Structures are given as C-alpha cells and as structure tokens.
RNA sequence: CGCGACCUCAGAUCAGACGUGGCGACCCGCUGAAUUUAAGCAUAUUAGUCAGCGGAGGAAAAGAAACUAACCAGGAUUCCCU
RNA sequence: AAAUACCGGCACGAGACCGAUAGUCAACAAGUACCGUAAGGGAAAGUUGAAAAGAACUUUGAAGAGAGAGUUCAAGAGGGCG
RNA sequence: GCCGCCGCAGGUGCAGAUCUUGGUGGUAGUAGCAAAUAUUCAAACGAGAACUUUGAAGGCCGAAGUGGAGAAGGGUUCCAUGUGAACAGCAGUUGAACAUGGGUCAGUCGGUCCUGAGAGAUGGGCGAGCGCCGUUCCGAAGGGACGGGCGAUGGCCUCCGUU
RNA sequence: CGACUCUUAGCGGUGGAUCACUCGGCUCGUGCGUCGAUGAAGAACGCAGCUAGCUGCGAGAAUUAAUGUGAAUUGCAGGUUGAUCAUCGACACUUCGAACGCACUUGCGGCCCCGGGUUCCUCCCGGGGCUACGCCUGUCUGAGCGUCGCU
C-alpha cells in the first residue's frame, strides 16, 4: 500500500493525522532495530518512511494555506505571508493607476496637439 | 579545562566526529580519485587554535 | 558549416557537454541502428536501445551472426551488456564485457504502449520533409 | 613550502615575464586606396598567361580554354548534383579531386586550438547576381564564390 | 528539558517515572538516565520495546 | 631570559570567537572584533588589501537566497500561477 | 475656583505606511599624500592622482541660456573628428 | 528620452595566444594542508589499459620480500603504474 | 602524430647573475646516541628476550618527595580487545602510534545572582562624514502601592486575586 | 695472478627532463542589467542504511509536490496505476548576523490566550501570540502666571 499523493487530497482534514502518526510508529521501531541488530529489510525501509511522512506533511499545509489565501482574496489588508511579493524595490515602485494619470491641461494639450501621420512627396 | 561553555564543548565535538579514516567502499566506486586522508589531526603536533 | 552563432565548433566545450552530461539525454547518444527489415517497415532508422532489445555485435572480437540479448544498460559508463558476450576471470567466475552502442545492431524491439509513440512520430517528420521537398 | 623563495623577477619561478604584453599593441595596418586598387589588375592578368596558373598547382591541362567563361544559366543552380555534373563537363573535376586528396591532419598546437583538418585551394567562381549559385557549390570543398 | 522528557516516556510506553538524570557526550548528544517505579518492572517493559 | 624562559609564562588568551565573522579574533578586553568590528553597525573593509576582500564576498559562501533570485529573474518574476494539469 | 477656543509642547506595545545593512566594475559630493622630475632643493612637478569618509542607478551626472560672437550672424545637453 | 561610460554580476560566441617550473594563487577535497596572539601570510600536487582481463592452483617463509603457473598485441604497461 | 620549398609573425639560441625551482655527490659508515650513583638470577607467554609480565636479591627518591590531589592551558591523550607496516634517533611482545569499541548522571559542589578598579547607552552637545565627547552634567527621566469612592468579572459576583 | 684506482661499452639501479595528449587559464566581443525588517551578504551547528572530505539540502534535512521526460540509480546488500532525469510556478527553511523584550554567561523578565496539576485557584510543568530604535499621516489621554473668552 504505497501512498500515492494524488489520492491524499480530497479526504477529511483530521483523518490524515491518524495516518501521520502511524508512519511515526511504523518508523520508531526502525531506530531500535538498526541499534540492536541487523536486518536490511528494516535498515533500507527507514528512507521510505522518512519520505512517506514528508509526503503527508506537505498536503496538510498546501491545502490549509490555500484556505487562508481564498479567505483573504478580496480583502485590502491581509497578512504578510499572503501579499504581492517578488523583489523589495519592486514592491515600492508606483502603481498601475499612479502611472496612467493625466492633468486636465495635458488632457487638454494632447487633445488639440497629438502627433500626426503624413508623408513627404519626392 | 574541566569547567567549560556550552559553546566550546560543541566545537570540540564537531572535530572528533570528523577526525577518523575513510571507509574504503568510497574507493571501490566508478571514477574515483582519493587515495587516503591527509586532513587527519593529531593532538601532539597541531593545535586547533581556539 | 554550422552558421547559427549559438552553437560551438570547440573541442574542449563539446567534450565537456559530453563528459559532464545527464542521465536522460544519455538515452539518445547511446542509440543504435535498426536492422535491414526495420528500416523497410516502420520508417525508423536509429533508435534508443532498451532493456530486453535483441541485438547483434558487428565490431571487435565478439562480432558475427548470433542474435543474443541485452541484460543491462550502464549509462554512467556509456556501454550495454549482452547475453553471452562475456569472459572468464582469474578465479573461474565469468564477468560481463561491455559494448558501446554504435557497435551493435538491434534485432527485436521491446514494443510497449509508450515505445510505439517514438516509432509513429518519426514516421511523420521523415515523411513531411520528403513530401515537402519532392 | 612557499616562503623565502623568489618573487618578482623574470628569472623566478612564479613571477612576472619580461615586458608583459598589452592590448594596445599596433595590430592593424593601412594601405592607400590606389595600391589595394593597383594589385587586382595583376592578380587578374596572371590568372589567364596560362603558364602561371599551372605553377599554382592547378589541374588545367585538359581545360578547354583561356580565362573560362559561361552562359548565364550557372547563376541559378541550387543543386550540387547539377553543379558537380557541370564541373565534369568543362574538364576541371581533376582539380577538386586534387582537393579531396589534399585533406589531412595538421602538425602542431594548431590542433588543440581547433584548426585541425587542413586542405588545398581549388577553382573560384565570379558572378553578377546570386540567384542560387552559393547553395550548389558551397558544399564542394575548395570552391569560393565571389561577386 | 527534563520536565519535557518525563511526559514523553510517560505518554508512549505508558509507565510512571521517579527521576530523569542527564548529561551531554563528547560527540555532542543528550543521554537521559530514566529511573522507574516499583509497581512497574524494567526487564519486562524493555522486552516490549525491543532492547534486549 | 628574553628568549625561551619567558615563552614559558603562557596560559591565557587575548582573542576568541567573534559571532558574526566567527573568526577567532574578537578582542576580549576591548570588546570589538579585529576582523569586522562586530559592535559597529556596518562592517570593516578596505581598498589597500584586495586579497583581503576576495576571501570574503557574495560568491564565497552559500548564497542561499541569492542563487535563486538569479534563477527566478529570466522569465518574468512569476508569482501565484501554476502550470496546466493532466 | 470653575467652563470653552486657540497657540506652543508631553506620552503610548494606540490605527496604518516608510528608513538602517550588503555588493561596488562604471556615476555623483567631500577630504587628500610622499616616493618620484628639476642631474642639489624650499616655489613648481607628481596631482586634485594613491589611501580615508559619504550617496545612488541600469547607466549616472548635464540640460532648453543673466549662451558664442563682432559675422551676410549662429541657437538645450552629451559624444567622436578637427 | 537619445546619442556616452561598464577589469563587479547573469548567460553566451571566438581566438596568427599559454600548454602542467607555462597559463589565474588555484587543470586535482584551494583561497584548501600549514604558520602568526591579531592585522594578515598562503603551497606542493594531471597521465595503467582497448577493456580490470588488477596476477585462481602450487611452493620457501612468522612477515614483508621471492620461485614457477596465468591475462594482455606488451607487465620490456603490476594500482603515485604513457 | 610529422616534414620540405615561397612568403608572414614573435614572450626565439646560455657556463656563469653569493641568479629561480627540482634532483644528486665527495666529506662519511665518519661527528656522534657521556648531566642528576646500579644492577643481577630464575620462570612463564613467542618464529625472535640486555630492555616487556610475574617472583627473589641489591639500590635511589627520603614528607621543601621521582608520594597524594587541583587551577590555567591541552581536547579524548582516560579504559579495556587487538595489530606489528610506519612513527616512539639501538630493539618492542611495549606505547600517550595505529584499528576497532565503551566511558563524564547533582535543589544541598560551581557558574548564574551583587558590586570592585574600571567598561558604556539615552538627554545634551561637537561633527563634511562613518562617528567622537561625556555619565549626573542645558532633561516633563517614578507605569507602582494601603486605603476613599464610581461601575464591571469569576465560585451559590456570598468573600477576594483580576482590571 | 688478486684488491684498489681511471676510461669506454653492455645490462640494472636511482631520478622525473623530453615528446605526445588537456572537462583548466589568459584576451576580445556581443547581449541582459536582478540584494535587503515579507529578515540580505556573511557565519555557526545539524541532515545519508553503509559516509570522513568537496557537493547539495534544513527537524518535510543528498530533499516534498507539480509540469515535462518516459525504465533507471549502482561501489555492494535491500527494495508502466510512472523508475530515473531536467523544469521550477504550489508547500517549507535550526542558531547567529542591519538583527529587534533585557543581556551574551546560551542567562533573567513582562503582557494576553489555550491544553494538562484544574474543576482559574493563585503559585506548577507544557504550546502558541505580542514586548528594538528613528520618522510621516491621522486618532486617544494631557501640561503650560503662552494668548484671549463668558459667568
């Protein structure tokens, strides 16, 4: 029963943590074996069971952090994890709006004096 | 010293862990190069500073 | 000539693109030809060699007409091992000996679901290029 | 190891050379407009006297004539199989065939700096409007085209 | 902590503790000596887990 | 007496581990670092020793936030979206 | 004594936004040598260069004249030839 | 805004260059072994073969060292080995 | 892997510079393994005993010790199982070497906690500048309490922490 | 006769030039021109079944998902409903460091809310969230024999 992570996503939030805390006892005995005596089927299994947990810990978060960033999707202020983010000095740049703006005089100077299309003859 | 800081003990512990010879399946590999180890420290010759 | 000035005519780099490579495009530098009745059939000439493809050797001490069979593809060393292509070591126990796959020729393809997908794509670009220029 | 042990000196191990090389050496030269001009008429008339063209090795003993000329239907050939058949008609294939022989490995460091295979010069062809002629010859070693 | 450790030996093998001494090795890890209760037994629980 | 007898009066240390540069060169009595001047708000560095600077700049160590800005740069700092499914 | 307006000035873990530090090859503002040339050496030279401190950007700085001229007048700034 | 500058950074393409006492201090676990209380100073060191086919069995010896067998086109290539 | 003929190009010819780097001789099996009294007989482990191990003799340190335990400093050198290459300036069965495997448990014994000569922030002031001077001196520097009173908790707002 | 002394040659030692190779440097050119309180550059300790060094990574520790590739990795043992490999867009990153409750001894605190001693009941052992300077916009609580006001 290999845990393929596609089909760990739709299930219910609690039911995982039962399954997390069986791969945290389906491991714990593998650091008694290695310490006491032999057995490679015990020894190599170790490195599945690590992964099998880090498979479970990721799903849990993905979906939770999803919950939040759809529970702040329209909001104006919102936590620092869940904002626009790339580069610092890209944050501080001016907005889409604040770079459109036209005063009434330039709205008026571009009104009567925009630039033409024409061609000289020979 | 027998008395010590938590910090200095930790320092001398990283170093033991290190200083001990190679396991030789590391020169049974494909393209390998390492003959033995010359970083090995011995306490009467060289000193750690600290 | 290569004209495109984002490709190099440089020894040293070319060998460093070849001798510091990956374990994925090493599937098609190790490819090998199809025989004289799989050129006539699928419209495919060379092909990547795989796990249970059958094969002749054609060059070295071990050539001749025996359709043996591949046992393993040792990508990290640019070489395949073949069934009875082997030799006797100083304690009696025989080894395998390896052959690079220019010096081989396929004789039965492993025909999966996904293998037939490289066979029927390559019967389009050979046949648009032939048709467009004829 | 390194200590008390020679340091700067064109004699020393490590340590600078005598008069280090500078980018701002004079790498180029110039010539007059009318000596780069004087020297084409000279390279043209000596490529006719036919006793000169032999002494540049070329394989002309069977060439019909002259300074050789051709109808304007060679400007548009895009195929090499047309342009090879064409090179055999006028009786000068033997000069390409001297070029196929001539291909070899070089001597020296040349090699590790990618100037490896070397080879001869052949016939060279002069045209007025490239209508395809570059494609048909450009694969046959030894041939320059030249507007 | 000691305080922390004492409930972790309590809430996985089920067993009640008397005292938990510690130290720290020259290789640099924590090794806790765990005394047990009289009604409990030491060779007996040791089999359950695996150390024999 | 100046030589080797007084070389045997040693049982003490002027410096130790700094905790910024980490460099056994943090002068106890004076309490700044000899390499970096730890208490000082910026660094110490200098234009008279250049083989001094190039033991120790942005290439040298890990680069662990930086080596994945450069990679994130060249398509167009893409954030939020995820590639089309199967 | 109280009540209210202003002016000048406290305090907050009050609500929301900004600065510090790094790299420094090219750019801007400061401060600033002596070897060495003069067959000695003090002015001169090195040179507003070395080292020191400070601020930035994908380039910086400059920029539509309290401008050149002396002509039959050119018409912001930077850059190459002269 | 542009026409200008760019021995640091991210990718690229070349060479009438140097070829392991050269060429960068660095072709290799190098800004690494090691030295100095500290500022700082800082190396040496590339190559079996086509393939490990890296020499079963015997024999002298306590052991390294040997004598014969044997793989290779060759050990007159025997694991720091053109 | 390489060379001749016509032309180009330069980091182009060694005996030497108390020149640079690497390697090797004569001297030479020579100088030498000389400070603080001293050893000998038997056995048993072993392929190898002047040196290790046990037992017996004769000796030295002589309590200001060649005795017993600590602080700086060292950083595992502590302890048993092996090994005989290299190292321990003759030798090794030995070793503080090498290789594997163990070993440092505290309310009551220290650090923490208080100040000493002294180190140093803020207010101020000096400064082109990173910064410097100064420590009670140009400061609105105390965020706490037993009670008097308004109105709100908890457990039968009964009685008190809690604002 | 012999040792020894000198020359030359053959074969052996000792040593690593010369030659031949090159996944490394040097120089010119083009193109883009991106660090940071949302915690940088730099440090420190940790992470493999067998593992010390370079590498890569963070208690999810030689890495987890997803998109692409389509049968390995390999030094020995064991383990096609997608191996291994590149892409990087979803998830995550110990302690220090401008480094941020106070302090550098890995030491002492204050504020709230949660699960256990409970049946908040303070003290007790665990788990979480705030507790640096400077400065701008405005809000709250106030000081002044500063300037006026009306009883």
UniProtKB/Swiss-Prot annotation, chain A:
GO MF annotation list: mRNA binding; structural constituent of ribosome
Domain of life where this protein originates: Eukaryota
Gene Ontology CC: cytosolic large ribosomal subunit
Compartments, as annotated in UniProt: Cytoplasm
Principal cellular location given in the protein's record: cytoplasm
Cross-referenced CDD domains: Ribosomal_L29_HIP (cd00427)
Coiled coil stretches, renumbered: none
Region of interest (Disordered), ranges: 84-122
InterPro entries the UniProt entry points to: Ribosomal_uL29, Ribosomal_uL29_CS, Ribosomal_uL29_euk, Ribosomal_uL29_sf
Phosphoserine PTM sites in chain numbering: 28
Protein keywords: Acetylation, Cytoplasm, Isopeptide bond, Phosphoprotein, Ribonucleoprotein, Ribosomal protein, Ubl conjugation
Family membership noted in the UniProt record: Belongs to the universal ribosomal protein uL29 family.
Subunit annotation: Component of the large ribosomal subunit.
Primary role: Component of the large ribosomal subunit. The ribosome is a large ribonucleoprotein complex responsible for the synthesis of proteins in the cell.
Name the UniProt record assigns to this protein: Large ribosomal subunit protein uL29
Gene of this entry: RPL35
Curated annotation (Swiss-Prot), chain C:
Subcellular location: Cytoplasm
Residue ranges, annotated region (Disordered): 1-21
Entry annotated with the keyword Nucleotidyltransferase: no
Top-level taxon: Eukaryota
SMART domains: KOW (SM00739)
Main location: cytoplasm
Subunit and partners: Component of the large ribosomal subunit. Interacts with DHX33.
One record GO biological process: translation
UniProt cross-references to SUPFAM superfamilies, sorted A to Z: Translation proteins SH3-like domain
Organism: Oryctolagus cuniculus (Rabbit)
Family, per entry: Belongs to the universal ribosomal protein uL24 family.
Function statement: Component of the large ribosomal subunit. The ribosome is a large ribonucleoprotein complex responsible for the synthesis of proteins in the cell.
SS bond list: none
Any coiled-coil regions, as ranges: none
Posttranslational modification: Ufmylated by UFL1 in response to endoplasmic reticulum stress, promoting reticulophagy of endoplasmic reticulum sheets.
One cellular component (GO) term of this entry: cytoplasm
Name of protein: Large ribosomal subunit protein uL24
CDD domains, alphabetized: KOW_RPL26
One term of GO molecular function: structural constituent of ribosome
Record's keyword terms, sorted: Cytoplasm, Isopeptide bond, Phosphoprotein, Ribonucleoprotein, Ribosomal protein, Ubl conjugation
Curated annotation (Swiss-Prot), chain D:
Chain positions with N6-acetyllysine modification: 22
Subcellular location: Cytoplasm
Similarity comment text for this entry: Belongs to the universal ribosomal protein uL4 family.
Entry comment on modification after translation: Citrullinated by PADI4.
Complex formation: Component of the large ribosomal subunit. May bind IPO9 with low affinity. Interacts with RBM3.
Protein name from the UniProt record: Large ribosomal subunit protein uL4
General function of this protein: Component of the large ribosomal subunit. The ribosome is a large ribonucleoprotein complex responsible for the synthesis of proteins in the cell.
Post-translational modification Omega-N-methylarginine, affected residues: 13
Swiss-Prot record, chain E:
Domain of life of the source: Eukaryota
Subcellular location: Cytoplasm; Nucleus
Cleavable signal peptide: none
Posttranslational mods: N-terminus is methylated by METTL11A/NTM1. Citrullinated by PADI4.
Family classification: Belongs to the universal ribosomal protein uL23 family.
Function summary: Component of the large ribosomal subunit. The ribosome is a large ribonucleoprotein complex responsible for the synthesis of proteins in the cell. Binds a specific region on the 26S rRNA. May promote p53/TP53 degradation possibly through the stimulation of MDM2-mediated TP53 polyubiquitination.
Domain notes: The N-terminal beta-like import receptor binding (BIB) domain mediates interaction with IPO5, IPO7, KPNB1 and TNPO1.
Subunit and partners: Component of the large ribosomal subunit. Interacts with LYAR and GNL2. Interacts with MDM2; this interaction may promote MDM2-mediated p53/TP53 polyubiquitination. Directly interacts (via BIB domain) with IPO5, IPO7, KPNB1 and TNPO1; these interactions are involved in RPL23A nuclear import for the assembly of ribosomal subunits. Interacts with IPO8.
Stated name of the protein: Large ribosomal subunit protein uL23
Organism: Oryctolagus cuniculus
């Amino acid at each position: 029963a290999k845990i393929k992570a596609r089909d760990l996503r739709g299930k219910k939030k609690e039911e995982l943590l039962k399954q997390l805390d069986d791969l945290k006892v389906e491991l714990s005995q593998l650091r008694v074996a290695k310490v006491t005596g032999g057995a490679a089927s015990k020894l190599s299994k170790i490195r599945v069971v690590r992964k099998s947990i880090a498979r479970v810990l990721t799903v849990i978060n993905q979906t939770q952090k999803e919950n939040l960033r759809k529970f702040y999707k329209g909001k104006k202020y919102k936590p620092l994890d869940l904002r626009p983010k790339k580069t610092r000095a890209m944050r501080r740049r001016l907005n889409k709006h604040e770079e459109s703006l036209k005063t009434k005089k330039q709205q008026r100077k571009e009104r009567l004096y925009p630039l033409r299309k024409y061609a000289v003859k020979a | 010293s027998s008395h010590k800081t938590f910090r200095i003990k930790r320092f001398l512990a990283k170093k033991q862990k290190q200083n001990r010879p190679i396991p030789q399946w590391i020169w049974m590999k494909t393209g390998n190069k390492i003959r033995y180890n010359s970083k090995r420290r011995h306490w009467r010759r060289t000193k750690l500073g600290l | 000539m290569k004209f495109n000035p984002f490709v190099t005519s440089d020894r040293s780099k070319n060998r460093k693109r070849h001798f510091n490579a990956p374990s994925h495009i090493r599937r098609k530098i190790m490819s090998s030809p199809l025989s004289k009745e799989l050129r006539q059939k699928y419209n495919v000439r060379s092909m990547p060699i795989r796990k249970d493809d059958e094969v002749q050797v054609v060059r070295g001490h071990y050539k001749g007409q025996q359709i043996g069979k591949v046992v393993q593809v040792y990508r990290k060393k640019y070489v395949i091992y073949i069934e009875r292509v082997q030799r006797e070591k100083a304690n009696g126990t025989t080894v395998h000996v390896g052959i690079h796959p220019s010096k081989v020729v396929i004789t039965r393809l492993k025909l999966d679901k996904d293998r037939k997908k490289i066979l029927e794509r390559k019967a389009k670009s050979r046949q648009v290029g032939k048709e467009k220029g004829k | 190891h390194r200590s008390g042990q020679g340091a700067f000196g064109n004699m020393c191990r490590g340590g600078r050379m005598f008069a280090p090389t500078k980018t701002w050496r004079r790498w180029h030269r110039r010539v007059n407009t009318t000596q780069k001009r004087y020297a084409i008429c000279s390279a043209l008339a000596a490529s006719a006297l036919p006793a000169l063209v032999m002494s540049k090795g070329h394989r002309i003993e069977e060439v019909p004539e002259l300074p050789l000329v051709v109808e304007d239907k060679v400007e548009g050939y895009k195929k090499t199989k047309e342009a090879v058949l064409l090179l055999k008609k006028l009786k000068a294939w033997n000069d390409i065939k001297k070029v196929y022989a001539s291909q070899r490995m070089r001597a020296g460091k040349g090699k590790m700096r990618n100037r490896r295979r070397i080879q001869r010069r052949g016939p060279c062809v002069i045209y007025n409007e490239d209508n395809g002629i570059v494609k048909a010859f450009r694969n046959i070693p030894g041939i320059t085209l030249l507007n | 902590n000691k305080h922390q450790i004492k409930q972790a030996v309590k809430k996985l093998y089920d067993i009640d503790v008397a005292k938990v001494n510690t130290l720290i090795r020259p290789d640099g890890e924590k090794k806790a000596y765990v005394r047990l209760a009289p009604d409990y037994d030491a060779l007996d629980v040791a089999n359950k887990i695996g150390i024999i | 007496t100046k030589g080797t007898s007084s070389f045997g009066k040693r049982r003490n240390k002027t410096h130790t581990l700094c905790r910024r540069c980490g460099s056994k060169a943090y002068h106890l009595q004076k309490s700044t670092c000899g390499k970096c001047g730890y208490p000082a708000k910026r660094k110490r560095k200098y234009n008279w020793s250049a083989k001094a600077k190039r033991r120790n700049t942005t290439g040298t160590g890990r680069m662990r936030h930086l080596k994945i800005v450069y990679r994130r740069f060249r398509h167009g700092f893409r954030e939020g979206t995820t590639p089309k499914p199967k």
